[PDB]
């Protein structure tokens, strides 16, 4: 009967014999919280989630004909004279991750898209850039020369916190008359930008458009660091000004849902196109998009202390409440559920509030 009662929901940590925790908690409470919930607006403060376990990205595989479960919707190019190289895509190799998970099966006629197994998760920038590298390198080698010159590579600074692009340096700078060039799949682009990039006509049949430009044009010279310094400097560097965390993320939302509290049922949006429609109805408690920018680390943890004003959900029937049930999920486009997982070292904590309707509303 009192005007307002708070409740605390925390979930500890429970691994399987196989190390994994379901971030759900559910509990029958040994004695009713609200005497009669017809006159309460339920709302939530202070909820918090360990995000330490989520991929940085789930890289996307081309939906076929494509029978290697592995190579993706990515590519690169080199030019010289200008003889081109047919784009080599990029092959997301398992053993840089895993290596110990079963791989799925590439899908002729039937359904064409490979469903996402925890197998595709990639954490770090250290792990993905190191993949473009094996591609550019492997690309370049079809079109040799002149003389000796390493193919370019991507590296990500810690605290930069910005990805870079290193390339020689007395060729292939774009101001020289004989320059070698880089191109992409225009899809892969989103991560790399904003390097300095001349645009070329979007999605052309033969691979190659967008043109990462080396030439400086800068307070931009760079060297080493694997030999004693030398004049002129070793290679040009073109770090992106913007620094993004970003386009990169696989986290597109998170969603606490609770199938117990008398509540009211609001619909979540789909990623389907055709159609929209079609309002669905299930209770939805609290849920937020990633707040840009909380700056990495935000990969470390999400947090939502309420800042006002009270945001109310409703409550309906007249059953004294006996159960706190709560589920947490993180979603990616294309919009699949993936119930969140709590890492060995952290505890997952919501809070709750009931207010007596009469104080708030006439």
């Amino acid at each position: 009967e009192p005007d307002t009662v708070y409740y605390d929901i925390l979930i500890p940590f429970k691994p399987n014999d196989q190390g994994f925790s379901p971030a759900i908690f559910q509990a029958q409470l040994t004695q009713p919280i609200v005497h009669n919930p017809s006159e309460y607006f339920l709302s939530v403060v202070r909820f918090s989630i360990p995000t330490q376990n989520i991929p940085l990205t789930i890289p996307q595989i081309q939906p076929y004909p494509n029978t290697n479960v592995n190579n993706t919707i990515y590519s690169v190019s080199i030019g010289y004279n200008g003889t081109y190289s047919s784009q080599n895509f990029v092959q997301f190799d398992p053993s840089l991750t895993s290596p110990n998970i079963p791989a799925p099966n590439a899908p002729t006629v039937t359904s064409p898209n490979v469903e996402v197994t925890p197998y595709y998760y990639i954490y770090d920038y250290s792990t993905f850039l190191q993949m473009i590298n094996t591609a550019l390198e492997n690309a370049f080698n079809e079109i040799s020369a002149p003389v000796g010159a390493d193919a370019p590579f991507f590296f990500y600074d810690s605290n930069t916190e910005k990805i870079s692009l290193i390339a020689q340096a007395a060729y292939y700078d774009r101001t020289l008359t004989t320059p070698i060039e880089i191109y992409c799949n225009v899809n892969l682009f989103t991560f790399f930008d904003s390097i300095k990039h001349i645009g070329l006509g979007y999605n052309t049949p033969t691979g190659r458009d967008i043109l990462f430009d080396v030439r400086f044009l800068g307070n931009n010279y760079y060297q080493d660091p694997e030999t004693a310094p030398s004049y002129p400097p070793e290679f040009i560097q073109m770090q992106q000004e913007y620094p993004t965390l970003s386009n990169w993320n696989a986290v597109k939302t998170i969603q606490l849902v609770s199938n117990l509290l008398p509540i009211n049922k609001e619909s979540i949006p789909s990623f389907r196109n055709s159609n929209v429609g079609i309002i669905n109805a299930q209770g939805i408690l609290a849920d937020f998009v990633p707040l840009v920018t909380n700056g990495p680390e935000a990969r470390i943890s999400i947090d939502f202390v309420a800042t006002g004003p009270w945001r109310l959900i409703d409550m309906f029937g007249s059953v004294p409440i006996y159960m706190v049930d709560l589920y947490v999920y993180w979603t990616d486009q294309t919009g699949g559920q993936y119930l969140i997982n709590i890492p060995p070292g952290r505890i997952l904590t919501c809070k709750l509030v009931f207010i007596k309707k009469s104080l708030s509303k006439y």
């Binding site: 199938n259 117990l260 669905n280 029937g317 059953v319 049930d325």
Partner: protein, 102 residues
């Protein structure tokens, strides 16, 4: 699901259910091998009864804006044991895999 009665003063029958087309694949564990003979056996492996209900953490329905929910997971295997007679067991119930664990 979300479904509103078609018309005014339309009474609604009380047996409700749900059909759900599925797909499953089994994979062998690379220990103890072999491992001779087909993975699925003749009188060795079949559905748990009743399947969907057992793997439901909880189901909710709200008749006319007032919420009613049950806890399907643990309640069931005990609520299923009685009050069942053979007549009834053989009837409505039969659709879902229906036999107990002796």
């Amino acid at each position: 699901f979300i479904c509103n009665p078609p018309s005014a003063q339309t009474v609604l029958d009380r047996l409700v259910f749900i059909q759900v087309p599925y797909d499953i694949t089994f994979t062998a564990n690379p220990s103890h091998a072999g491992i001779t003979e087909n993975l699925l056996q003749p009188g060795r492996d079949a559905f748990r009864a009743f399947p969907i209900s057992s793997i439901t953490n909880t189901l909710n329905a709200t008749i006319n804006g007032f919420p009613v929910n049950i806890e399907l997971a643990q309640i069931i295997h005990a609520l299923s044991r009685y009050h069942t007679p053979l007549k009834v067991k053989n009837g409505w119930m039969s659709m879902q895999p229906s036999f107990e664990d002796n």
